[PDB]
Ligand binder design. Structure first.
Ligand SMILES: Nc1ncnc2c1ncn2[C@@H]1O[C@H](COP(=O)(O)OP(=O)(O)OP(=O)(O)O)[C@@H](O)[C@H]1O
Ligand SMILES: [Mg+2]
Lengths: 101, 304, 53, 69
């Protein structure tokens, strides 16, 4: 299916015939392989408290475009980009991302 | 409990659904409280409110393991919400999902009503590709033939199976009138203007089935024959076909000067000669090879 | 200067309605098309001749 | 022009304000006002999401202290 051979894809050539056997999606450069395979905490928003005004507001901006885009097509708005966590060390900031992951 | 004041309690709970989100979203009590206000908003004809507070509920799945009276009253409001608009396949998907939930307690009668709700209107949904596998999955089961509506279903599959709406309204009216059980039959058809439109849409779906069988099993037909075979006038027959051809769903072309609606197309001389040689090649070479080799194979069995 | 755009919206509204009566048929009489547009027959011909040219 | 507003309450008070506003911030306020209709299960501007979104985005740093005029 030569239409799938876009100019810049990755293929696997024969050793002797040198023709294309099977194409490949993309390299994943193992420096970032370890940046995916890890378990957060198996948490369920129950190891967190006193932050529910800020927890839900962060769950509002992230969970809606990845689940419910119909609420963003009915209103003439572009779905938003990411947020920021700032403050003194000790109140969440890692467990909160551990919750949403 | 004081009155059915439908304006005071409705707006005063929508202004507090934003409030107690801060207690964590518990699997039962939070879910039961958030389904309470949608049946209120269905009652005061606030349909824009109900479909959004119900759109949140899909993040809680597979919650029917511990309770059973949760998924029933959820879908019973979802079938009514999509009832006011069209798109009948979504009510069928909800009807099939309320078909296996009470049945786990071996319902003697409630299992029959959920069976009747599914099998009643599947033809009423639009036919694109999703009616095709749906009528292949809900049919051919061990427990469906207890009702003659399965024979009504099997008649409206395809190949016309000798269908006519005047014949259809006269033999199955007892199913539409009072019968033995007849409990979902009054619930869907035989009602106020909600039900009367469903007569028209059932009339609309059978003639849409009757146009598709004509365009496949005919080439040309006079317009007087098509009008009398659809039990309606010549003006409605033209306007109904004009609705289909601008919808690019039935592919034909009429004549209002001699009355010949034809069904084929002017074929191309490149296309026609290629289809000539293709029926020349695969019908006079492959089987021609086969005639020689079976006659060679009969040389062994016959002699000696 | 507004009546020029009114004429262009008028002539658009003719050719939008006069293409919804083309897909059902090849050969047709004209008096049905006059009755379906419910306007006239003479301006329909001058519009249809303009669309072919 | 694309977002449904359809209101009597116009954004005229929030035009001639001080504290000069970049062109990307108009997009951020109208998104944040859009979030404050959707989160509370509305569909239309109820003349308060625009003001709460403005008061959220402006709180960075402020008064000249009535000093050096
Ligand atoms: N708001 C909170 N609610 C519940 N537990 C918390 C909270 N904040 C911290 N903890 C506890 O702290 C630990 C996680 O530390 P945390 O992620 O808060 O550090 P941090 O704020 O990311 O530190 P730094 O900001 O220096 O990176 C967990 O064991 C958790 O029990
Ligand atoms: Mg940290």
């Amino acid at each position: 299916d030569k239409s799938k051979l876009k100019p810049g894809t990755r293929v696997a050539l024969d050793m002797t015939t040198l023709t294309i056997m099977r194409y490949l999606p993309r390299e994943v450069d193992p420096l970032v392989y370890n940046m995916s395979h890890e378990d957060p905490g198996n948490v369920s928003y129950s190891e967190i408290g006193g932050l529910s005004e800020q927890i839900r507001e962060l769950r509002e901006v992230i969970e809606l475009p990845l689940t419910n885009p119909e609420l963003f097509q009915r209103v003439g708005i572009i779905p938003p980009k990411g947020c920021l966590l700032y403050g003194p060390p000790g109140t969440g900031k890692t467990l909160l991302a551990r919750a949403v992951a | 409990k004081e009155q059915n004041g439908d304006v005071k309690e409705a707006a005063s709970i929508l202004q507090e659904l934003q409030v107690e989100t801060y207690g964590s979203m518990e699997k039962k009590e939070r879910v039961e409280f958030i389904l309470e206000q949608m049946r209120l908003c269905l009652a005061v004809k606030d349909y824009i409110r109900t479909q959004i507070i119900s759109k949140k509920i899909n993040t809680k799945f597979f919650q029917e393991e511990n309770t059973e009276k949760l998924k029933l009253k959820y879908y019973n409001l979802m079938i009514q919400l999509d009832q006011h608009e069209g798109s009948y396949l979504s009510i069928c998907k909800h009807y099939r999902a309320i078909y296996d939930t009470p049945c786990i307690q071996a319902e003697s009668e409630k299992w029959q009503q959920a069976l009747k709700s599914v099998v009643l209107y599947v033809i009423l949904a639009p036919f694109d590709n999703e009616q095709s596998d749906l009528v292949h999955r809900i049919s051919g089961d061990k427990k469906l033939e207890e009702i003659p509506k399965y024979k009504d279903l099997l008649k409206l599959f395809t190949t016309m199976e000798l269908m006519r709406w005047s014949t259809l309204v006269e033999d199955y009216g007892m199913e539409l009138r009072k019968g033995s059980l007849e409990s979902p039959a009054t619930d869907v058809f035989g009602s106020t203007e909600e039900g009367e439109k469903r007569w028209k849409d059932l009339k609309n779906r059978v003639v849409e089935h009757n146009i598709r069988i004509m365009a496949k099993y005919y080439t040309r037909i006079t317009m007087k024959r098509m009008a009398q075979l659809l039990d309606l006038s010549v003006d409605e027959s033209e306007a109904f076909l004009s609705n289909l051809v601008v919808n690019k769903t039935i592919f034909a072309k009429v004549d209002r000067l001699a009355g010949i609606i034809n069904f084929q197309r002017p074929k191309d001389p490149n296309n026609l000669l290629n289809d000539w040689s293709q029926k020349l090649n695969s019908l006079m070479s492959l089987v021609n090879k086969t005639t020689h080799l079976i006659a060679k194979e009969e040389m062994i069995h016959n002699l000696q | 200067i507004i009546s020029t755009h009114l004429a262009k919206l008028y002539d658009n509204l003719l050719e939008q309605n006069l293409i919804r009566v083309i897909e059902p048929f090849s050969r047709v009489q004209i008096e049905h098309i006059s009755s379906l547009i419910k306007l006239s027959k003479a301006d329909v011909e001058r519009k249809l001749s303009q669309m072919i040219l | 022009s694309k977002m449904n507003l359809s209101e009597e309450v116009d954004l005229e008070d929030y035009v001639a304000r001080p504290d000069k506003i970049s062109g990307a911030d108009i997009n951020s306020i109208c998104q944040e006002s859009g979030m404050l209709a959707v989160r509370e299960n509305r569909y239309i501007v109820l003349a308060k999401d625009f003001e709460k979104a403005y008061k959220t985005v402006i709180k960075k740093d402020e008064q000249e202290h009535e000093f050096y005029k």
